[PDB]
Every structure is written in structure tokens, then in C-alpha cells.
Design a binder for these strands. Structure first.
Ligand SMILES: [Mg+2]
Length: 755
RNA sequence: UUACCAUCAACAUGGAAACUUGGCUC
RNA sequence: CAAGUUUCCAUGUUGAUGGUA
């Protein structure tokens, strides 16, 4: 790990709000023991309790996470200890053998610095659910929602270039007080004779949380013929009944025994697991609650928190940490002095770039909104459409007359050669004839057109068949519209005119440019759209800049082969992108900037060594063509929050800032660029990690190049979460992997259909 | 599948730490 | 070397409503 200077010079500094820890390193050695509880107890409760029962041998300074104990003082090689169970009087044989001597400056200390913090905030009467800690003392209970929300904290200790830190997100968790058992009782009261089908309809596909070990478990089946009075064989090879299993591990004596059982079947590899309804609770958000205007406006008025409400909750967490003595000793025996106040990050607002139109050229303001700049002038990079087929079934005539009769009105300020659509009716929406109509006609409209498949209600098979026929068998676009979305005239201005230009974008109509000071720049946003829940061939979305001023982009999907992890596609995808580049610009690039998507933090090493070296060795297809490459990894689901520290309060700004110190990764070169256009909530910043940077790019150069790449997507008046090719490839990869399950047609490749 | 933007929920994948089991060779 | 368990984490995707629209 080299000492790399990351801070830039050009920009206006800011102030942020989430570091929360600075510790001094003092302990010369920490001693790790792995403990085998013989016989096996599985719950954390006894594994804490009988370890706390023997502080004469272990000591008061303890850190145990279920199987691993940590000490500051070395014992002998193996210590053997006898314990007796509080319920069945078992012969529990604790064996502690020292396995690791943790150095003060080793990255392996992060697990036990994290479990000591979990043991710290388990003393504040804070519960564990899933991964996080949630507070039951500031809940909101919603009776008509049948719901309860907890304002907990997802807190995690991690190492950073600015030392040790603890990142805490104010994570509100929804918990249903209704279990699966009580909602089974409610459905059985609602339907005494016909409840098994409702249980098999609202139970499979639904996912429960069990709180005896807080595990989240996917329901695959529910069985009524088997009760926990029947026994089974657990991991030690000896038969146990489930009630004695409860009394020996979790200690939670059940209230009834005539309840059914739930079957969970894991993925292929195998151990089928059985869960009681009483100890298992719902996912607490009802979609049957949701279908009204009063759901979020009465629930998430507090859950969609302000930045100041985040800072108040986090300062309340710090206050209850500091004012609790028993939590303070559990930090200060190990010598981990938490900071009693927040620790703040500096900022950097970049010199904001220029958006070049056909004639005008704006300096981008602080608001990033040019919503009604559309319908101004005719665009050069457009094929002027004339005719397109519009279909509607036998229930929604005037509903179609909501849309199209307004749409010719926004041909007013443009004044292009427009004509009314082919109003072709439908006799029956029952699966068939909707396939037959479109490729029965395919007529005068089919030059540059727009397929509008309008379906009453939510039906997956209908739109799947329509999009499969209307994007596989013929060169033709398609667009699914549900009548439930357009069912009211109130949602017309926001549904028909400003948006639903998917079809006008699918024929390739776009222009605006951002200035780039470099020469011969090829930027290429590789994305990987994975669908392993369906367990079939993952999809690569390939998009590259095939020109100089970045106005045109490439598109490619190739299905992978199952049981073959090595990518056979990306060489062909780069071959196609380079062939399109040599067909359009008639030249070869000098630098390549790749924005790879979708890897974990432990996976970049693979991207450092198992894929990008294959990209460098892929260039054998062209003679003496081995130039410099730049690789980046984009990240979305981030837990770091950003607030500007105005001298009165905290407000998350508009996108544009740069955070590059004391939040990054310890090994690679990272930065964070905020991309939420914040109207409410806290703006998560996009995380960009580089892998190979041999083009000698300064940090401000690649940060401003990333924001420039964020500036060039034809879908919005305001900036985007991930830059433009990683949303192009997202849209085309999702479309070509989940809906038609096929490659896009070659005959549409001159358009930018990824919009 | 209509512009992105939160939040909620869910699934799946990957890295590290050791433990246990199994596998041709001492 | 492979598989499983427990800890730490990390990562995308999907579905849903509230907002500028
Ligand atoms: Mg993606």
C-alpha cells in the first residue's frame, strides 16, 4: 500500500458530516480463540450467557460473536471448561485454543473491533434484526397499517486512508407485529373453508424474519401435516425434538403446538429447513396497505428524514453511548476511545462545466434543471417520424383519447412533419390477437414508428409475449403501457408530454455536447446485468463512444454460457465496438476509459487480475495496437451520507461535489461524487474506484471526466446516479436479458435505443 | 415499462478470519 | 485443494408507493 496523494487544488471546499471515530493504536497483541461448544448450542444467547458465567477463567474483558472469543491476555495453549445448561442440564465443554496473534496494524482486527462495538450497543437495549441494530424505544405504531417502525442505526467500523472510522446510517426498519401465524389466523377468520390457497398465495414469494437468531428466511412452501411434536436429526447426528431444541438453544417456550410448519429449500449445491410460524414474523410492508394516497404521506413523513434529522439521530446515538457507563467500559478496557462529537469531512465543488446546445451554451447553475427547454427547434440527429400504429382494447377508448389528442399539441412549437397515428382497435385482450395485429399490418407506418401495447391491469405473460414477438421476430420497437397508470386525467401533464418519449428516443434522437480538453478519448461503459435468481445466462451491456464529440454510442448484448465463468463475449464486444469506431471515425483511439459495474469490494482483485489482464491480451486482433487503458468501478448501494454544514444547520446539496479523503478504500484509489438531485432525503454519493490508471490522470481530471460523462444522457433535465454509458448498458442489458431473452436486432443499430 | 430520486422490502453473488468434513501423494 | 458453519462486511438487481413533474 503506497502513500498516494489524493487531494486536488481547483475547486471550492465544503464541509461534510460523517466520520465519527479516531483511535490511537496501543495494544501489542490480541489473542484469538476459536471455541467448540460440545454439545452444540446454536443461539447466541447461551453462547453469551455461559461464557459470562466463567469470568473467573476467561476474564471480564470479553468479545464473543458466537464462535470466536478475543482476549488481551494470553492463556495456555488449550483450556477446557465445564458448564451446565439452565434448562436440560447439559455437559457443555468449552474448549479455548489460541489460533491467531493479531498485530496492532493488521486488517484482521476489523472483525473484532466490530464485534466489540456490537457488544457495546447490545447493552443499550438495542435489538438485532438482519444485520443492523434497531431501537425499540422511539418506535411508531400504525394500527390501520398493522405496522411498527423502528429508528435504528446501521453502523459499521472500517479502515480508511484517514485511519479507523465508523459509518452509521440512520436505517428505519419496518416490523410487522402481525406474524405469519396471526395473519394466518386473520385469513382463516376471513375465510374458514378456503384458507390454504390464500396461504399458498401470500406465503410463497413472501419472506419471513425469525428472531431467535434474527435470520431472514425465504419461504418456499408451507406444510400443515407436520408439527414440532415430531422430532428430527440435527448436526451432531443425534435425534432431537424441536421443543427441546428451543429450550436448549433459544429458550423461547412456545405458546401453542398445533400451528403448521414452514419449509425453506435453499439453492442447489441442500439442507431443507423448517420454521415455526410463532417465532417467524412478516416482512412488515403490506402492498395491500399501499394502494391509497395516505400511505407514505402518513408513514414516511419521518422515515424520509431530513439531513438534520440524520444528524440529530446520530448525535442521540453518541449521547446515549457517552452517558452509559457500562457501554463506556466495554470501549475503554480495549482502549478504543470513541469521539464524543462528530468528525467532519472537507469538500470540493468542481468548476462546473458548460452544456453546449445547437446554438446556445450554458454555464451549469446550482440547480441543474432545464425541464421545459424541449420543443424548441428541430434536431439534426433525428429521423423525422410520420406514422405509428396505436392499439387499444375494448375497454379504454377515451383513455387513448387522453394521450394522443394532446401529443400532436407538442408538435406545435416544433412543427415537424407529423401525422396522426394508425388507430387500430383490438377485439380481445385475452392473450391472443395482439400478437397477430402488429405483424399482420407492419405497413406504411413501419419506417420510423412506435408500438404502443396498452394492457388493462398487471399481466406479466401478455407483455412478455408482446415484447418477445415485437423485439425478436421482426426489426421493431415496442412499449408497454398499463391503463392503471394513465387511468386519471390528473396524471396527464407528467405522463404524456414530458415523458413517454421512449419511442422518440428509441429511433435515435439526441444532441448536446460537453467540452473535453483531451485528444483521442475513447470512453466505454461496460456493465454486467446478472440474473442468477432465475439461474440462467448473465448479460453484458456494452456501450462505447464511437466518435470524437461523444454524440454517438455503441450497443451490444451477448448471452453467456452456463457453467462457464470465463467471458467468451467481451472480446467479440470490443471487436464490434472497434469495428463501429473504425467505420464511423475511420481511426483508432489513444486512451481507453472503462467504467465497469457491479463487483463487491473483495472482487476488484479479480477485476485487477482475472478480467482486465484479459482485456489487455484481447488486443492481439489488431497489429501494433496496445495503448494505455483506464479502468473504473461504479458503486450505487452506498451507506455514506453527505450533509453540508451551514452554520445554522445541515443540508445535502445538489450533485457536483468531490469527496476523496477519509472515506475511501485503504488499498485502491477511490472518490465519491454526489449524484442524488436532492428534493428530500439524504443524498447518497456514487463511489468510483479505479483499478488501472496508467494514463497519468490527475484526480481532478478523472473526477471532472466522470462528471462530464454524467452530463451526457438524453433522458433528463437533472444529473444521474451513474454516468451515461452505465445507464445505456443498464437499459439495453435489462431489456435484452429479462424480457425478450435475445440479442437486439442489427437493423436497429444506427439508433440509440438505450434511452 | 414512461425522466430520475428517495425510502422500504426481498433475492443473489463475492472477499477475509479460522473451525469441521472429504480427497492421489509423504 | 474442495464443500459446509459462524463472524465481519461488500455488491448489484427486482417490486412497491411519496416527490419535482
Ligand atoms: Mg448495473
Amino acid at each position: 500500500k503506497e502513500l498516494l496523494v489524493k487531494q486536488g487544488s481547483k475547486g471550492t471546499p465544503q464541509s461534510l458530516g460523517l466520520n465519527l471515530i479516531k483511535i490511537q493504536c496501543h495494544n501489542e497483541a490480541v489473542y484469538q480463540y476459536h471455541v467448540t461448544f460440545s454439545p452444540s448450542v446454536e443461539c447466541k444467547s447461551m453462547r453469551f450467557g455461559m461464557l459470562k458465567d466463567h469470568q473467573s477463567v476467561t476474564g471480564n474483558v470479553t468479545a464473543f460473536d458466537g464462535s470466536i472469543l478475543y482476549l488481551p491476555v494470553k492463556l495456555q495453549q488449550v483450556v477446557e471448561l465445564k458448564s451446565q445448561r439452565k434448562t436440560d442440564d447439559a455437559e457443555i465443554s468449552i474448549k479455548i485454543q489460541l489460533t491467531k496473534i493479531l498485530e496492532p496494524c493488521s486488517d484482521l482486527c476489523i472483525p473484532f473491533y466490530n464485534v466489540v462495538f456490537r457488544r457495546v450497543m447490545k447493552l443499550l437495549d438495542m435489538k438485532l434484526v438482519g444485520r443492523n441494530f434497531y431501537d425499540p424505544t422511539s418506535a411508531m405504531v400504525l394500527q390501520q397499517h398493522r405496522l411498527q417502525i423502528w429508528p435504528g442505526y446501521a453502523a459499521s467500523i472500517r479502515r480508511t486512508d484517514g485511519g479507523l472510522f465508523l459509518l452509521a446510517d440512520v436505517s428505519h426498519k419496518v416490523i410487522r407485529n402481525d406474524s405469519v401465524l396471526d395473519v394466518m389466523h386473520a385469513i382463516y377468520q376471513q375465510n374458514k373453508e378456503h384458507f390454504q390457497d390464500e396461504c399458498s398465495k401470500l406465503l410463497v414469494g413472501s419472506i419471513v424474519i425469525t428472531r431467535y437468531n434474527n435470520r431472514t428466511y425465504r419461504i418456499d412452501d408451507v406444510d400443515w401435516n407436520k408439527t414440532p411434536k415430531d422430532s428430527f436429526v440435527m448436526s451432531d447426528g443425534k435425534e432431537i425434538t424441536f421443543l427441546e431444541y428451543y429450550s436448549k438453544n433459544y429458550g423461547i417456550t412456545v405458546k401453542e403446538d398445533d400451528q403448521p410448519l414452514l419449509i425453506h429449500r435453499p439453492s442447489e449445491r441442500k439442507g431443507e429447513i423448517l420454521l415455526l410460524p410463532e417465532l417467524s414474523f412478516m416482512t412488515g410492508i403490506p402492498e395491500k396497505m399501499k394502494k391509497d394516497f395516505r400511505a407514505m404521506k402518513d408513514l414516511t413523513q419521518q422515515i424520509n428524514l431530513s439531513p438534520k434529522q440524520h444528524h440529530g439521530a446520530l448525535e442521540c446515538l453518541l449521547q446515549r453511548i457517552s452517558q452509559n457507563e457500562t457501554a463506556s467500559n466495554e470501549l475503554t478496557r480495549w482502549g478504543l476511545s470513541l469521539h464524543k462529537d462528530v468528525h467532519k469531512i472537507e469538500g470540493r465543488l468542481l468548476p462546473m462545466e458548460r452544456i453546449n446546445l445547437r446554438n446556445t451554451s450554458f454555464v451549469t447553475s446550482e440547480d441543474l434543471n432545464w425541464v421545459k427547454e424541449v420543443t424548441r427547434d428541430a434536431s439534426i440527429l433525428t429521423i423525422p417520424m410520420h406514422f405509428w400504429a396505436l392499439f387499444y382494447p375494448k375497454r379504454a377508448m377515451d383513455q387513448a383519447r387522453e394521450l394522443v389528442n394532446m401529443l400532436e399539441k407538442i408538435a406545435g412549437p416544433i412543427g415537424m412533419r407529423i401525422s396522426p397515428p394508425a388507430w387500430v382497435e383490438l377485439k380481445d385482450d385475452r392473450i391472443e390477437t395482439y400478437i397477430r395485429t402488429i405483424q399482420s399490418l407492419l405497413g406504411v407506418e413501419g419506417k420510423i414508428q412506435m408500438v404502443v401495447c396498452i394492457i388493462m391491469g398487471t399481466r406479466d405473460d401478455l407483455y412478455g409475449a408482446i415484447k418477445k414477438l415485437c423485439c425478436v421476430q421482426s426489426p421493431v420497437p415496442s412499449q408497454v403501457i398499463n391503463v392503471r397508470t394513465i387511468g386519471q386525467p390528473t396524471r396527464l401533464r407528467s405522463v404524456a408530454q414530458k415523458i413517454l418519449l421512449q419511442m422518440n428516443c428509441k429511433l435515435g434522437g439526441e444532441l448536446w455536447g460537453v467540452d473535453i480538453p483531451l485528444k483521442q478519448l475513447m470512453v466505454i461503459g461496460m456493465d454486467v446485468y446478472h440474473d442468477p435468481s432465475r439461474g440462467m445466462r448473465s448479460v453484458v451491456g456494452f456501450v462505447a463512444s464511437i466518435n470524437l464529440t461523444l454524440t454517438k454510442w455503441y450497443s451490444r448484448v451477448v448471452f453467456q454460457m452456463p457453467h462457464q465463468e470465463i467471458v467468451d463475449s467481451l472480446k467479440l464486444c470490443l471487436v464490434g465496438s472497434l469495428k463501429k469506431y473504425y467505420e464511423v471515425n475511420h481511426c483508432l483511439p489513444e486512451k481507453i476509459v472503462v467504467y465497469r459495474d457491479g463487483v463487491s469490494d473483495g472482487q476488484l482483485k479479480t477485476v485487477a487480475n482475472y478480467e482486465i489482464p484479459q482485456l489487455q491480451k484481447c488486443f492481439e486482433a489488431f497489429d501494433n495496437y496496445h495503448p494505455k487503458m483506464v479502468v473504473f468501478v461504479v458503486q450505487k448501494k452506498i451507506s455514506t451520507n453527505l450533509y453540508l454544514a451551514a452554520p445554522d444547520h445541515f443540508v445535502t446539496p445538489s450533485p457536483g461535489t468531490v469527496v476523496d479523503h477519509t472515506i475511501t478504500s485503504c488499498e485502491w484509489v477511490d472518490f465519491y461524487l454526489l449524484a442524488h438531485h436532492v428534493r428530500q432525503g439524504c443524498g447518497i454519493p456514487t463511489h468510483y474506484i479505479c483499478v488501472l490508471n496508467t494514463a497519468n490522470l490527475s484526480p481532478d481530471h478523472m473526477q471532472r471526466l466522470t462528471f462530464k460523462l454524467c452530463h451526457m444522457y438524453w433522458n433528463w433535465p437533472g444529473t444521474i446516479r451513474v454516468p451515461a454509458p452505465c445507464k445505456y448498458a443498464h437499459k439495453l442489458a435489462f431489456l435484452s436479458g429479462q424480457i425478450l431473452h435475445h440479442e437486439p436486432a442489427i437493423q436497429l443499430c444506427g439508433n440509440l435505443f438505450f434511452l
